[PDB]
Amino acid sequence: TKKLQATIISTKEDFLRSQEILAQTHLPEKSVFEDIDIKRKEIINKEG
């Protein structure tokens, strides 16, 4: 029980570190699917 209390304290510290990492948004590009469609159109046009 003491060992698991120490482990859960470490997990809480890891959760706080995870929240600090989550503070950095690292948002995916808003137009990834749009860029994929644009390159698909470009490759189709290039092959045509």
Binding site: F33, I36, K39, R40, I43, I44, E47
Partner: protein
């Protein structure tokens, strides 16, 4: 009639040309399918 025989030879090779054009359009459709397959959404993120 000599002209008719030779132009029937011409129409035969034109149908062979038409058959080759159909084969080439089918190959173009298949390469279009290939490039369609290349640019497809990948659902391996949850798998990873």
């Amino acid at each position: 009639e000599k002209l008719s025989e030779v132009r029937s030879r011409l129409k035969e090779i034109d149908g062979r040309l038409k058959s080759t054009k159909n084969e080439m359009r089918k190959t173009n459709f298949r390469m279009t399918e290939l490039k369609m397959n290349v640019g497809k959404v990948v659902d391996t993120g949850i798998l990873n």
